[PDB]
Amino acid sequence: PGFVGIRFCQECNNMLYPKEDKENRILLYACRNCDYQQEADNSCIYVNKITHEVDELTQIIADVSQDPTLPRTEDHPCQKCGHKEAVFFQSHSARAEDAMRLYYVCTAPHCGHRWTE
Amino acid sequence: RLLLAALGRRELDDRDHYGNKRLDLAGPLLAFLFRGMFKNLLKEVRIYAQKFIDRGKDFNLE
Amino acid sequence: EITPDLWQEACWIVISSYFDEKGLVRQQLDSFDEFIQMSVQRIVE
Amino acid sequence: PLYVDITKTVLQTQHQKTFIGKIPIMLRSTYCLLNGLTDRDLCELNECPLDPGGY
Amino acid sequence: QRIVATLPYIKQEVPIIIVFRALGFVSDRDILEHIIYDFEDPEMMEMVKPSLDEA
Amino acid sequence: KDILCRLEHTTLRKVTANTAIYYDPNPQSTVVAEDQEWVNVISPWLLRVELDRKHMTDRKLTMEQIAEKINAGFGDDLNCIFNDDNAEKLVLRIRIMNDDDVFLRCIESNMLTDMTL
Amino acid sequence: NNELEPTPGNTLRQTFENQVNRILNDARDKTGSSAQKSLSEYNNFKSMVVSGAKGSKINISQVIAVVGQQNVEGKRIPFGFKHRTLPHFIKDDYGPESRGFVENSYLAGLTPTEFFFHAMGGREGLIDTAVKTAETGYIQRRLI
Amino acid sequence: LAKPRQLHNTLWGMVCPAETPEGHAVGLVKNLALMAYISVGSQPSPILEFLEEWSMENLEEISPAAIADATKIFVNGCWVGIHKDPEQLMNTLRKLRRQMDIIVSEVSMIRDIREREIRIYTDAGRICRPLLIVEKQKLLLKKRHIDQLKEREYNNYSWQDLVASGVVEYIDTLEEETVMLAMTPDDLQEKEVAYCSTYTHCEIHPSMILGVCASIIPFPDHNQSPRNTYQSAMGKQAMGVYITNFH
Amino acid sequence: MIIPVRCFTCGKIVGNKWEAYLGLLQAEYTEGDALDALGLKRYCCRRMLLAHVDLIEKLLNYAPLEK
Ligand SMILES: [Zn+2]
Ligand SMILES: [Zn+2]
Numbered sequence: 017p018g019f020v021g022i023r024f025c026q027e028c029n030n031m032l033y034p035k036e037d038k039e040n041r042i043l044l045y046a047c048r049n050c051d052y053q054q055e056a057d058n059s060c061i062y063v064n065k066i067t068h069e070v071d072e073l074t075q076i077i078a079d080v081s082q083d084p085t086l087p088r089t090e091d092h093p094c095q096k097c098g099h100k101e102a103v104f105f106q107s108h109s110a111r112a113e114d115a116m117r118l119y120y121v122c123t124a125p126h127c128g129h130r131w132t133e
Numbered sequence: 134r135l136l137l138a139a140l141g142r143r144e145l146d147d148r149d150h151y152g153n154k155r156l157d158l159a160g161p162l163l164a165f166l167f168r169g170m171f172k173n174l175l176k177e178v179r180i181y182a183q184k185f186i187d188r189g190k191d192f193n194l195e
Numbered sequence: 196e197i198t199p200d201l202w203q204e205a206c207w208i209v210i211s212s213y214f215d216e217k218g219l220v221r222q223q224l225d226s227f228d229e230f231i232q233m234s235v236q237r238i239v240e
Numbered sequence: 241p242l243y244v245d246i247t248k249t250v251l252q253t254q255h256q257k258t259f260i261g262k263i264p265i266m267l268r269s270t271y272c273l274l275n276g277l278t279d280r281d282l283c284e285l286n287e288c289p290l291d292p293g294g295y
Numbered sequence: 296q297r298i299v300a301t302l303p304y305i306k307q308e309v310p311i312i313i314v315f316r317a318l319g320f321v322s323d324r325d326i327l328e329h330i331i332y333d334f335e336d337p338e339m340m341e342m343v344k345p346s347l348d349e350a
Numbered sequence: 351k352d353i354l355c356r357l358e359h360t361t362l363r364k365v366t367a368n369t370a371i372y373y374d375p376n377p378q379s380t381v382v383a384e385d386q387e388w389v390n391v392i393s394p395w396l397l398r399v400e401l402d403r404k405h406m407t408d409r410k411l412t413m414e415q416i417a418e419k420i421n422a423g424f425g426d427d428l429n430c431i432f433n434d435d436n437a438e439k440l441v442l443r444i445r446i447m448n449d450d451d452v453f454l455r456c457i458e459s460n461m462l463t464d465m466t467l
Numbered sequence: 468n469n470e471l472e473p474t475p476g477n478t479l480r481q482t483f484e485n486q487v488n489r490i491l492n493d494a495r496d497k498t499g500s501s502a503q504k505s506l507s508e509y510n511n512f513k514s515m516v517v518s519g520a521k522g523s524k525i526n527i528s529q530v531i532a533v534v535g536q537q538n539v540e541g542k543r544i545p546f547g548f549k550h551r552t553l554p555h556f557i558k559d560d561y562g563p564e565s566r567g568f569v570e571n572s573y574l575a576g577l578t579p580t581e582f583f584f585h586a587m588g589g590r591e592g593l594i595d596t597a598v599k600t601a602e603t604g605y606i607q608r609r610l611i
Numbered sequence: 612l613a614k615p616r617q618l619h620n621t622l623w624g625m626v627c628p629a630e631t632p633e634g635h636a637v638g639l640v641k642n643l644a645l646m647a648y649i650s651v652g653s654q655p656s657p658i659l660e661f662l663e664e665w666s667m668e669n670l671e672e673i674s675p676a677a678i679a680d681a682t683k684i685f686v687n688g689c690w691v692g693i694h695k696d697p698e699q700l701m702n703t704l705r706k707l708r709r710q711m712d713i714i715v716s717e718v719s720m721i722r723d724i725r726e727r728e729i730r731i732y733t734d735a736g737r738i739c740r741p742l743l744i745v746e747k748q749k750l751l752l753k754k755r756h757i758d759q760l761k762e763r764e765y766n767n768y769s770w771q772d773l774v775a776s777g778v779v780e781y782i783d784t785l786e787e788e789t790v791m792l793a794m795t796p797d798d799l800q801e802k803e804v805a806y807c808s809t810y811t812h813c814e815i816h817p818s819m820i821l822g823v824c825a826s827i828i829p830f831p832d833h834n835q836s837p838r839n840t841y842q843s844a845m846g847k848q849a850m851g852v853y854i855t856n857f858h
Numbered sequence: 859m860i861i862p863v864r865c866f867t868c869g870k871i872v873g874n875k876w877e878a879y880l881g882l883l884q885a886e887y888t889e890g891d892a893l894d895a896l897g898l899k900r901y902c903c904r905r906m907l908l909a910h911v912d913l914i915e916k917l918l919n920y921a922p923l924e925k
């Protein structure tokens with residue numbers, strides 16, 4: 017599935033809480049500070065992923081490729097730009113080092129391509 | 134920073150890191166001590182001048 | 196240019212120059228002189 | 241010895257070179273007597289040239 | 296699962312949102328935009344919601 | 351290992367894979383649209399939890415036993431619709447009979463913590 | 468490349484460090500066995516240790532063959548820096564040299580990195596001795 | 612409390628490892644290493660003027676949403692601003708630190724590229740040691756410079772003159788954390804089976820990690836660490852002619 | 859501060875050999891060869907003619923305050 021974000025009351029720049037409408041059995045994000053209501057786009061209001069399988073590829077930024085302290089490799093090239101040199105590194109985040117996974121970011125500038133073998 | 138600490142994406146800090154420890158020399162120490170006791174000296178000077186202005190006489194600096 | 200075999204004597208004379216310039220009590224003298232040069236006037240101002 | 245100048249405005253009065261007190265100096269400092277003296281001058285002044293100082 | 300603060304000369308644990316409102320930021324929008332820099336943070340949503348939903 | 355799993359403490363926190371809530375006022379039609387909605391066919395909102403076959407294989411659990419355990423724990427206030435073992439995914443659906451979804455969040459946090467299943 | 472299959476009962480990281488410890492222990496034991504087989508029987512080290520006066524068969528191994536892996540708090544030396552034991556090594560490497568295993572003997576001499584690791588071990592032993600003596604004094608006084 | 616008096620990893624070249632008191636306080640008292648020097652501290656106002664004459668905007672004028680992409684810039688911990696591209700301004704700050712034109716050699720800068728930020732430290736209390744600067748596979752400490760250094764006391768070629776030349780620079784703890792080191796130019800920076808080939812700084816001499824007593828200790832690579840610690844402690848008891856003018 | 863007159867192990871006369879050693883090192887011989895030229899065969903005398911430090915020049919560089 018996917019996460020569901022904040023619905024914003026735009027005119028007073030505030031939060032919207034989902035409350036039910038019983039006249040037609042629908043869900044309506046209403047403001048508590050003022051009177052502003054929006055239809056619920058989806059039935060999911062709250063979701064908790066407990067397995068902690070988050071996209072570490074999106075978590076990792078591409079600026080780490082130019083760091084000299086990180087080791088450099090040439091075994092696997094960049095897929096999009098074809099440059100041979102990649103940087104292999106770990107998660108560096110908690111509750112992940114139980115499985116040490118390798119992430120390659122291409123050292124070629126202006127491509128910014130990262131991938132997992 | 135607290136949210137990234139709770140998530141664990143950012144690693145926590147260690148009190149044993151000498152990068153995160155500073156080392157005071159005699160300079161900051163003497164400056165701080167002189168600051169405090171110079172404030173005490175100014176307190177003495179102002180209460181002395183206040184005593185003379187209560188007495189209606191001009192305060193003597195020396 | 197630089198020679199790996201003469202690098203030992205090169206780094207040793209670098210060490211000699213560094214100790215001849217500095218000494219050992221540089222941090223004590225520098226902290227005290229910095230304090231007595233600017234910090235006390237900064238306190239009184 | 242340490243001095244300050246005094247600016248009072250009761251009528252502005254200036255009182256320059258007013259003694260506060262005496263502040264300790266460690267040896268071989270920039271205001272110490274043992275500043276710039278060579279080994280000959282220091283041994284004439286009966287102090288060790290090889291002493292580091294700073295205390 | 297909320298967030299409070301320990302402050303000098305304060306005997307209580309004051310919430311961060313009401314601290315921001317005492318500072319002047321009473322808007323939830325600029326409170327969120329001051330507590331985050333990259334706006335797309337749903338994990339921040341489920342780990343910040345009790346504090347603002349209390350305060 | 352049977353005596354092991356009989357002795358060692360198990361919690362819904364360590365057994366769940368993920369959880370969510372979906373506002374489905376009609377019990378016949380749901381956002382998940384699984385077969386268990388037709389197996390079932392009064393809370394307008396439903397609570398859906400999805401388990402993990404790694405933990406069912408490790409603990410040798412029968413999700414009928416989990417369903418009867420949670421039914422005994424929460425009484426007749428909450429009905430649980432169980433996903434029969436047709437695939438890897440097992441879903442428990444929770445609906446309240448007759449305060450609101452914040453109280454539903456509180457009781458799902460409670461069951462996540464300490465049912466001691 | 469993640470061909471490692473984790474042992475049941477522990478994580479992949481714990482399994483990997485168990486494998487590393489097993490390999491290093493086996494290598495060090497083989498090294499010591501080879502040396503003590505070849506001590507040439509005219510060594511005063513051998514003669515005095517056979518007399519049982521002082522020292523140990525492993526002490527011949529450190530002084531002659533190899534120092535071996537040193538352990539802090541019952542494990543390898545942790546990443547005090549940013550995921551690295553020293554800035555002299557690259558980021559995210561798990562080599563025995565970079566993690567605290569000594570490849571040299573006392574006769575061969577040590578690199579400054581493993582000398583620092585031996586300093587870690589010696590300081591750990593000394594702090595243990597100090598707290599041991601203080602606490603056993605207090606406990607003996609309590610019992611008396 | 613074992614941990615604060617335990618020996619930490621962050622002590623390479625700051626404090627000699629094998630010099631401790633032996634009694635009730637082991638590890639809370641340290642003795643300064645050779646290359647280790649303490650930052651004297653400086654005012655960050657010329658640095659902030661450098662930022663603002665340059666292109667790093669303050670936090671109050673910048674739009675809020677367009678802080679997501681940029682990198683934060685702190686000076687002495689407190690937050691100053693953001694900038695879109697820390698590249699080439701990190702290099703400008705490094706070379707200006709090397710030439711001591713406006714950025715001093717003493718003030719340090721750390722660029723966290725994992726989390727998009729950079730911190731400038733003008734403060735006193737930081738401990739640093741001199742280290743070589745190497746850019747390519749080849750070093751910058753040239754035969755001309757060692758020729759003047761050998762013909763010292765005539766040209767008045769100084770260590771400060773070397774720092775002005777920018778061959779070597781002061782490196783403190785956070786920067787040592789974030790930089791890679793080359794242990795030996797004759798052994799590691801030389802071309803062979805490459806380890807990383809991304810060497811940025813180089814140590815002067817490994818024995819310089821030792822201290823005042825460990826320096827007179829002979830063969831510590833052969834000695835045991837408890838013996839080295841004992842001998843380094845006993846060096847203060849080592850009796851001899853303490854001062855020249857003792858009479 | 860002064861050269862010992864005799865070898866601690868042997869007892870060979872050493873006191874003149876110090877000033878002679880300084881004369882030969884001013885005459886620019888390698889110090890081991892100059893030591894052999896002075897004729898100190900045993901290392902237990904070679905050590906004291908080799909690695910003796912003199913302090914009395916500094917002590918006399920100090921002024922005599924007891925005159
Ligand atoms: Zn509103
Ligand atoms: Zn690429």
Ligand SMILES: [Zn+2]
Pocket residue numbers: 865866867868869870900902903
């Ligand atoms: Zn003799």
